Amino acid sequence: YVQELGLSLEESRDRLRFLQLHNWLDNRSRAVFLELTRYSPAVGLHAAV
Amino acid sequence: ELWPWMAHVLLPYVHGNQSSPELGPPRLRQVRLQEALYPDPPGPRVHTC
Amino acid sequence: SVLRELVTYLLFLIVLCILTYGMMSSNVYYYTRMMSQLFLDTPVSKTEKTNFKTLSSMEDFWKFTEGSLLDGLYWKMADNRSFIFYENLLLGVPRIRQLRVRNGSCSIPQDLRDEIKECYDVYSVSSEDRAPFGPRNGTAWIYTSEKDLNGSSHWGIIATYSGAGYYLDLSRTREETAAQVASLKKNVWLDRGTRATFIDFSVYNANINLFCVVRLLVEFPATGGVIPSWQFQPLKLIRYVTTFDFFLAACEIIFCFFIFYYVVEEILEIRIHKLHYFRSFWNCLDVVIVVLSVVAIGINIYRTSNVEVLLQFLEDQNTFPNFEHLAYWQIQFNNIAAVTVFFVWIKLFKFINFNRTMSQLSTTMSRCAKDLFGFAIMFFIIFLAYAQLAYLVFGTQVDDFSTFQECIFTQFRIILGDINFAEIEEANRVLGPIYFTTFVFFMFFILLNMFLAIINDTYSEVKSDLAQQKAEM
Amino acid sequence: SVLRELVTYLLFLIVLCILTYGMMSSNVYYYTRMMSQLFLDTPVSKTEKTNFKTLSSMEDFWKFTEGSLLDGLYWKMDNRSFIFYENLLLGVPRIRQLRVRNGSCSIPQDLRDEIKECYDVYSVSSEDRAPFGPRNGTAWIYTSEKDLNGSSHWGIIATYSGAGYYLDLSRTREETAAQVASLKKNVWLDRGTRATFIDFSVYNANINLFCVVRLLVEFPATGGVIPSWQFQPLKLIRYVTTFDFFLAACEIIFCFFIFYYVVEEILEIRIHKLHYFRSFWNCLDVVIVVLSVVAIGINIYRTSNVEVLLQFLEDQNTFPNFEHLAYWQIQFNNIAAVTVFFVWIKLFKFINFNRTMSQLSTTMSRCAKDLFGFAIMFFIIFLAYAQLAYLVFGTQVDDFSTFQECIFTQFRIILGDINFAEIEEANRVLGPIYFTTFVFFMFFILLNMFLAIINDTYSEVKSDLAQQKAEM
Amino acid sequence: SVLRELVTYLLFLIVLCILTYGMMSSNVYYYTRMMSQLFLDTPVSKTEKTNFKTLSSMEDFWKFTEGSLLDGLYWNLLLGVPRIRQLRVRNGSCSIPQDLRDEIKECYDVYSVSSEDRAPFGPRNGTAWIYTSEKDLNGSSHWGIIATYSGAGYYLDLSRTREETAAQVASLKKNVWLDRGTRATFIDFSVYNANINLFCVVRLLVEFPATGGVIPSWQFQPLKLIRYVTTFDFFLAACEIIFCFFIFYYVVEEILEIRIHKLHYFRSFWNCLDVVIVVLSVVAIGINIYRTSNVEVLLQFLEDQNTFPNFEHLAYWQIQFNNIAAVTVFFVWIKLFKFINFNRTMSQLSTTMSRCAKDLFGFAIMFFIIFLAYAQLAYLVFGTQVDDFSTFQECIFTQFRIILGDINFAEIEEANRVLGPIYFTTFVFFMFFILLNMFLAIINDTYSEVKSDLAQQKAEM
Amino acid sequence: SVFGKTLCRALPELLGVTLGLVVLGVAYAQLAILLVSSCVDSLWSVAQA
Ligand SMILES: *[C@@H]1O[C@H](CO)[C@@H](O)[C@H](O)[C@H]1NC(C)=O
Ligand SMILES: *[C@@H]1O[C@H](CO)[C@@H](O)[C@H](O)[C@H]1NC(C)=O
Ligand SMILES: *[C@@H]1O[C@H](CO)[C@@H](O)[C@H](O)[C@H]1NC(C)=O
Ligand SMILES: *[C@@H]1O[C@H](CO)[C@@H](O)[C@H](O)[C@H]1NC(C)=O
Ligand SMILES: *[C@@H]1O[C@H](CO)[C@@H](O)[C@H](O)[C@H]1NC(C)=O
Ligand SMILES: *[C@@H]1O[C@H](CO)[C@@H](O)[C@H](O)[C@H]1NC(C)=O
Ligand SMILES: *[C@@H]1O[C@H](CO)[C@@H](O)[C@H](O)[C@H]1NC(C)=O
Ligand SMILES: *[C@@H]1O[C@H](CO)[C@@H](O)[C@H](O)[C@H]1NC(C)=O
Ligand SMILES: [Ca+2]
Ligand SMILES: [Ca+2]
């Protein structure tokens, strides 16, 4: 269930609250699988979390 | 209780004005399994899966 | 005569043992443990479980500073001094320093120069900031060179930090130091450009005449995180107070005379008698012993001859006493002396040949050394081949193979049975168990037994030759 | 023939085993276990989490004596106290301290104006003997060792005298609390204080077994607290039951056996066979008889003087002084255990009945000189490494605090029982060098030399016994 | 001839290695450990951080018996009714010394059959205050930690609902039931899993030493009910009958063979191993058929009943069957070596051992003499302090674990500062550098001699 | 040159030793896993040894 969870500035919390209130994955949910990214500009290596 | 987790340590880590060059917004990809699950097991829970 | 060199070697050993007993005094370990437990194990405050050993962020450092550090430093009895355990006197004032880097000392790719507006490089001398910042009024906001600060390099964990940076000398009272650190925290002092921070102080403890120098370092790597490290070093700078100190001085003079005798005896022989002189392995031990001894004597003379930092501190006692070089040279001298003692004790094998069993064993070892070296070449090649594989495969996830020397140490610990499988197993589901099981089998079932084969063969051959030559002539 | 020696030795072994089984009354361990759990693991107060094993300062010590100590000492049914409704508390506990005097050391003239007092480490030549505080009672006046019936203790830091400033507490909590509060108000533990002792005893009439409890707190000259404890289950009413008389008879039987052995051994060396020390079994026999006569002397000397128990019985409102009995009981136990161990290894004198045992014993005896010679070299190397470790880690690790600690830690490294996380951080270079070289040389060299010597000796012995026999 | 023996042995092994699969793959261990965590380590109440494994006082026992115990027994449960009993001793069973009896007026000896108390005490109302002998109490010995306890005592059986058992235990606690003479107490019950087929008999013992305190111990025994409703049952039934046929074949062929070698048959190791295997197998079959024909009360107590299910005659046989069908598997597995020793490079490795066993046994005797000397010294020195040397068996096992690297050395040095480290260092040195090398010396010499005689007298024609 | 040759010629013997060791280990492991099955937590000396 691809949820963007965007709205970088301030509405990310609003989107999370709307998803929680609307019961997006309340029942019948196995895993969450949250994963974005990383980038270390100094060392020069990226990372996948 | 992972929603308070996200609201407390994840969103500040991503959108905070600190050392975290994300290189792309995060995402969520859960499962639905097309079938609900029984309630919590009284006493002992499921062994592994 | 053998008896003469034997008796002089025993006298040398006795004076060495006396020196080692003297330098390793009464229980300084308890002094060190009390200081270490006071400053490293107490939680940063009454409601957290974090201490200095488990710092994890920059805010934890601020919690520790205006917190457990001031709690340990200042003990209540006109501007009275502070005795840490009612016995350890705090000398002068502590000092706090930071080393920083420069903004824009990095290279942001042109396709990412729109959501990344600042990159700070890793610490290096050619990249450290030297410009004023913040409320540029005092010395905490102005760069000071290494020569104006009487500093030196440190060799921390991530890099080797210079002796410059931005510093403050704190106060003798809890209230003033608390105000100073609160002001430092308010006008942000530690930011994303901060790379290292030092805290330095010293105590005396007049009961047993022995100074203690304390240094606490916190490193902030470019990749984020916090790495703490610490150092407590006891020193003796007022040596001659008791009769035992004079006895130790006399023993030191005797040691210098013995070293002069040994070196002149060495040079009297190397001159013309037996110009090669190197096919013995006992002459090499003698020369390394005298070289280590003369190095230790030179270090001691260079270190105890000047105590001008102590004399300058005794003029006015409201300043920072700088004792880092003395502690550094004390550590160096301790290492050199320990190695010298070890080798002097090893040299004792030169005289235990009093019967037909000692000579048999010595001949066996001498005749076995060559092919032991020959097979140890292969043993070390295979050992390093396993170590590099462990470094490349597990070196980014396991913390036990993070560096090559650490891989070597972990592989040596596996032989003793001191392995923790709970972290190595999930680092790689395949090639994790394979490495472990093959290493164990080929290390205990194969390579440990070839040493036995070689030693057993040479010992039996030596005995056979010694029993066939004898009883047949 | 020779079976006379065999039957005599078997009877002696049976008697010794009976003595040691009677000496080792079953489930005495639980007595001391409950006592130590009650007095050592209870937190000093309901709020804090520290116990006697984790004392860290003088205030913790003051909280202990107004807390867990008094809670464990005094139980509710003057009236006597029963520690677990079974263990009767004998008399009153006693608290003592040893302290040094101000000016016992020299302050260097460089900073003399900043520091006024210095107190030396504890030593008999440097201990205070002058009155202090509110000089009214015995807690403020020095009492000599001879007038206090004391003795040395050999603590962790130093060996402490039997003298000092002492106070006898009361039989009830309501007065002991007042006495300790009075000692706390008028400061009794100053910067000169070097050691403190608490002593008492209990009976437990169900089984016939006393218990003597001593707690020690040492204050090093560099600040801090070092605690120690000792629980000893004595027995002083020996003859109560039939088994007691059985053990008493077995004791005199043992004495007769020892007398017979010593008279036979001295008869064998009156003028007969001068210098029989070339043998090994004779040295074992003389060691056994020396140990046995020493143990008999210790037992006779400690059991003929229990007057300290008669007196306490005359007046049961005083301090029962039982520390000498506990010390001598410990000495006797050590001597008896060593004697039993040395008696057991005397069976090797008799297990030669078949030929395989004869070959095994011959091989074992013929590999003695080579193993001794190589053990000399092994221990030279071992002690060199121990000295290196002591000089490098002697002030940081605490497994190398003392030389003997270094030896024990080196013996435990072989079995893989150390951290190496603290060794590597105490010294980054020369720390791991020691570890790697030690492991390499111990495992890949010396163990293989031991096995090589044993293999060669066994092969040669089997070969020449197969040569002289079956070929002649 | 050898091929027939090989194929029949592989058949007998393939049937056996899957017959044991149905014994270890029943997930009985999961149920037993689930019950153990359910009953043992759960706190007595939210305000006390204590459990049954860490009981230390009589009040702790009273808290436990009205608490986690009732919660576990009341919330596939409660086969009949549980039972709680106690064993006590007699006032005056031990003699106070004369000089001390002026102060102490009670003496309670340690538990013994001669010192046991049989008189009534408290309110003489029912079974809880009157002595019942062992024969009519349907019980036997227990062999506890510090003593061996009889099957008698003062007992009381609870009921089927939580409220009345709580009332009963509250009444027992009201008028004191555990005096100073109380030496042991037992709690017994049974639980039917009722999920597939599995019973669980639960025994709890609390011991009161003559000195003071408590000592807890527990025992969970899973029984087994036999029923065939799925192919996974008929398959094992067929495997068991084929196994019985295999023992029949082996015993009849052994009887056939012994007719020709009535005395010249018990000198080879393989034949004596075979006969001990077959006798162990027939004993196991006898116990199995005895136990399977006892389904008369296994289902009688499933209906709601107010009687204590005395399930001890079955647990004993269930225990005795498991630990004799395990040695049988071990001996069956180690008989495969006889078929392995047929290669040209494998018969040497067997002849070597069969030739050096004579010396290995003798040096084992000598090694065990030295080992027992160390064990007895350690028992006499550390006996009352360490808890690893509290009993002789514990001393032996602790030394064996020290050889394998399971050292503690903290309390060893605390207990005795001198002669404690001495024992450790000497033991480690002798057992690591000297004593364990002699076995290898014996094996090495035997291997060298075997190889020499086999390669020199042969391989020359 | 000897060290390489020795390990090459002792392979059949070493393989036989490993086969014997693994068979003995399998037998003992099955004994141990089938031996307890009780969870008694007491000194069952006969079964404990
Ligand atoms: C760092 O430098 C970049 C350009 O080099 C600039 O955009 C940014 O504002 C600077 N940040 C600070 C904190 O000086
Ligand atoms: C900087 O130092 C001056 C010295 O007088 C002081 O007045 C000023 O307040 C300081 N700056 C801050 C931000 O405190
Ligand atoms: C460095 O040493 C000199 C020598 O006395 C001293 O005057 C100066 O104050 C020291 N540097 C600092 C920053 O205190
Ligand atoms: C300790 O002794 C010194 C030496 O005379 C003296 O000056 C000081 O006042 C003494 N202090 C106390 C507390 O007795
Ligand atoms: C010392 O003891 C006397 C005798 O009882 C008493 O009067 C006095 O109050 C005591 N001193 C103090 C400070 O209590
Ligand atoms: C020491 O022993 C004697 C025995 O005669 C006794 O009178 C005295 O009271 C004892 N000392 C103390 C302080 O009780
Ligand atoms: C039994 O107990 C009573 C008091 O509890 C006591 O007086 C009596 O002596 C005891 N019996 C014996 C034989 O000691
Ligand atoms: C004890 O004896 C037999 C055993 O089955 C039985 O008849 C009797 O009822 C038992 N007693 C009970 C259960 O109270
Ligand atoms: Ca020379
Ligand atoms: Ca003799």
* Distance, CA of E374 to CA of E368 (rounded, Å): 10
Ramachandran bin of C101, using left for φ above 0, alpha for ψ from -120 to 50, beta for the remaining angles: beta
Exposure string of E150-189, with b = 16+ CB inside 10 Å and e = fewer, is: bbbbbbbbbeeeeeebbebbeebbeeebbebbbbbbbbbb
CB contact under 8 A, C223 and A43: yes
The minimum CA-CA distance between F16 and chain E, rounded to whole Å, is 6
* Distance, CA of E246 to CA of E460 (rounded, Å): 46
Does any CB of chain A come closer than 8 Å to the CB of residue B40? no
Q: Using DSSP, state whether C197 is helix, strand or coil.
A: strand
Q: What is the CB-side half-sphere exposure of residue E382 using CA atoms within 13 A?
A: 33
* Distance, CA of E388 to CA of E402 (rounded, Å): 11
Q: Is C135 in the pocket of ligand 2 (CB under 6 A)?
A: yes
Instruction: Give CA angle at E302 (E301, E304), nearest 5°.
Output: 85
CB contacts of B19 in chain C (<8 Å) are 192, 224
In sequence order, what are the residues at sequence separation of 6 or more whose Cβ sits closer than 8 angstroms to the Cβ of residue D9?
Answer: D346, D350
- Helices D447-468 and C448-469 cross at an angle (nearest 10°) of 50
CA-wise closest residue to D299 among D291, D308, D307: D291
Instruction: Give CA angle at E72 (E71, E74), nearest 5°.
Output: 60
CB contact under 8 A, F37 and E322: yes
Q: Using DSSP, state whether C64 is helix, strand or coil.
A: helix
For C168, C220, E281, the CA distances from C184, given in Å and listed in that order, are 10, 18, 83
CA-wise closest residue to D196 among D97, D128, D122: D97
- Chain CA centroid to CA E306, Å: 31
Give the N- to C-terminal CA distance of chain F in Å, as an integer.
Answer: 48
Q: Is C117 in the pocket of ligand 1 (CB under 6 A)?
A: yes
CB contacts of E425 in chain D (<8 Å) are 407-408, 411
Cβ atoms within 10 Å of C438's Cβ, excluding its own: 11
CB C212 within 8 A of CB C202: yes
Does any CB of chain A come closer than 8 Å to the CB of residue B1? no
CA-wise closest residue to C401 among C413, D8, F12: C413
Q: Which chain E residue lies closest to B44 (C-alpha atoms)? A: E34
Would you state the structure tokens that stand for residue F8, as one six-digit string? Answer: 């090459």
The minimum CA-CA distance between C60 and chain A, rounded to whole Å, is 23
Residue D115 CA to ligand 4 center (angstroms) comes to: 10
CA-wise closest residue to C216 among C208, C225, C228: C228
Chain F contact partners (≥3 CB pairs within 8 A): C, E
Residues counted in chain D: 472
* Distance, CA of D82 to CA of D67 (rounded, Å): 18
Mutational pocket test of ligand 3: of C150, C198, C318, the residue with most ligand atoms within 8 Å of the beta carbon: C150
Mutational pocket test of ligand 4: of D112, D116, D132, the residue with most ligand atoms within 8 Å of the beta carbon: D116
In sequence order, what are the residues at sequence separation of 6 or more whose Cβ sits closer than 8 angstroms to the Cβ of residue C117?
Answer: none
Token pair 């000492």 in the structure block, residue = D73
The minimum CA-CA distance between A4 and chain C, rounded to whole Å, is 19
* Distance, CA of F40 to CA of E218 (rounded, Å): 6
Helix, strand, coil content of chain D in percent (nearest 5): 55, 10, 35
Q: Is E294 in the pocket of ligand 8 (CB under 6 A)?
A: no
Question: Testing the interface with C: which of A8, A43, A45, A46 to mutate, by most C Cβ within 10 A?
Answer: A43
* Distance, CA of D406 to CA of D384 (rounded, Å): 11
Burial of D339 (0-12, 13-18, 19+ CB in 10 A): buried
* Distance, CA of D351 to CA of F21 (rounded, Å): 33
Residue C137 CA to ligand 2 center (angstroms) comes to: 6
Residues counted in chain A: 49
CB contacts of D396 in chain C (<8 Å) are 29, 32
How many helices (H) and strands (E) in chain D? 16, 5
Obtained via which technique? cryo-EM
CA-wise closest residue to D453 among C346, C463, E364, E370: C463
Helix, strand, coil content of chain F in percent (nearest 5): 75, 0, 25
Residues counted in chain F: 49
In sequence order, what are the residues at sequence separation of 6 or more whose Cβ sits closer than 8 angstroms to the Cβ of residue D446?
Answer: D378, D381, E433
Q: Is C209 in the pocket of ligand 1 (CB under 6 A)?
A: no
* Distance, CA of B2 to CA of B6 (rounded, Å): 6
* Distance, CA of C361 to CA of C462 (rounded, Å): 9
Please give the number of the atom of ligand 1 that sits closest to the Cα of C103.
1
The minimum CA-CA distance between C182 and chain D, rounded to whole Å, is 30
* Distance, CA of E78 to CA of E159 (rounded, Å): 10
Contact F/B (≥3 CB pairs under 8 Å): no
How many helices (H) and strands (E) in chain F? 3, 0
CA-wise closest residue to C386 among C367, C408, C405: C408
In sequence order, what are the residues at sequence separation of 6 or more whose Cβ sits closer than 8 angstroms to the Cβ of residue C101?
Answer: C120, C121, C122, C123, C124, C127, C128, C129, C193, C195
Q: Is D138 in the pocket of ligand 5 (CB under 6 A)?
A: no
D100 DSSP β-pair partners = D127
CA-wise closest residue to E199 among E28, E69, E83, E40: E28
Token pair 């205050």 in the structure block, residue = E129
Q: Is D415 annotated as a binding residue?
A: yes
Q: Using DSSP, state whether D166 is helix, strand or coil.
A: strand
The 3 state secondary structure assigned to chain E is CHHHHHHHHHHHHHHHHHHCHHHHCCCHHHHHHHHHHHHCCCCCECCECCCHHHCCCHHHHHHHHCCHHHHHHCCCCCCCCCEEEEEEECCCCCCCCHHHCCCCCCCCCCCCCCCECCCCCCCCCCHHHCCECCCCCCCCCCCCCCCCCCCCEEEEECCCCHHHHHHHHHHHHHCCCCCCCEEEEEEEEEEECCCCCCEEEEEEEEECCCCCCCEEEEEEEECCCCCCCCHHHHHHHHHHHHHHHHHHHHHHHHHHHHCCCCCCCCCCHHHHHHHHHHHHHHHHHHHHHHHHCCCCCCCCCCCCCCCCCCCCHHHHHHHHHHCCHHHHHHHHHHCCHHHHCCCCCCHHHHHHHHHHHHHHHHHHHHHHHHHHHHHHHHHHHHCCCCCCCCCHHHHHHHHHHHHCCCCCCHHHHHHCCCCCHHHHHHHHHHHHHHCCHHHHHHHHHHHHHHHHHHHHCCCCC
DSSP state of D445: I
CA-wise closest residue to D388 among C173, C334, E455, E141: C334
Give the N- to C-terminal CA distance of chain A in Å, as an integer.
Answer: 19
For A32, D254, D360, the CA distances from D344, given in Å and listed in that order, are 68, 16, 19
Burial of C279 (0-12, 13-18, 19+ CB in 10 A): exposed
Q: Using DSSP, state whether D231 is helix, strand or coil.
A: strand
Cβ atoms within 10 Å of D425's Cβ, excluding its own: 14
In sequence order, what are the residues at sequence separation of 6 or more whose Cβ sits closer than 8 angstroms to the Cβ of residue C266?
Answer: C286, C287, C290
CB contacts of A41 in chain B (<8 Å) are 21
- Chain CA centroid to CA F25, Å: 3
Would you state the structure tokens that stand for residue D244, as one six-digit string? Answer: 């007691």
* Distance, CA of D221 to CA of F37 (rounded, Å): 58
* Distance, CA of E240 to CA of E16 (rounded, Å): 9
Token pair 């705090």 in the structure block, residue = C90
Resolution for this PDB entry, in angstroms: 2.8
| Pick from F34, F39, F47: CB nearest E329 | F34
* Distance, CA of D302 to CA of D236 (rounded, Å): 10
* Distance, CA of E400 to CA of B46 (rounded, Å): 39
Helix, strand, coil content of chain B in percent (nearest 5): 30, 5, 65
Q: Using DSSP, state whether D236 is helix, strand or coil.
A: coil
CB D169 within 8 A of CB D138: no
Q: Which ligand is nearest to the CA of C120?
A: 1
| Nearest residue by C-alpha to atom 10 in ligand 5 | D136
Contact D/C (≥3 CB pairs under 8 Å): yes
Q: Using DSSP, state whether C100 is helix, strand or coil.
A: strand
CB E178 within 8 A of CB E61: yes
Alpha-carbon torsion, ordered C182, C184, C188, C191, to 10 deg? -120
* Distance, CA of D287 to CA of E330 (rounded, Å): 47
CB contact under 8 A, E75 and B47: no
CA-wise closest residue to C329 among C304, C310, C309, C294: C304
Does any CB of chain F come closer than 8 Å to the CB of residue C374? yes
| Pick from F16, F28, F41: CB nearest E346 | F16
* Distance, CA of C420 to CA of D420 (rounded, Å): 13
CB contacts of B35 in chain A (<8 Å) are 28
The minimum CA-CA distance between D391 and chain C, rounded to whole Å, is 6
CA-wise closest residue to E363 among E315, E298, E435, E294: E435
Cβ atoms within 10 Å of D79's Cβ, excluding its own: 8
- Helices C2-23 and C324-346 cross at an angle (nearest 10°) of 150
Q: Is C361 annotated as a binding residue?
A: no
CB A5 within 8 A of CB B7: no
Residue D16 CA to ligand 10 center (angstroms) comes to: 19
CA-wise closest residue to C223 among C396, C463, C15: C396
Sign (positive or negative) of CA dihedral E323, E326, E331, E337: negative
Would you state the structure tokens that stand for residue D301, as one six-digit string? Answer: 């000397």
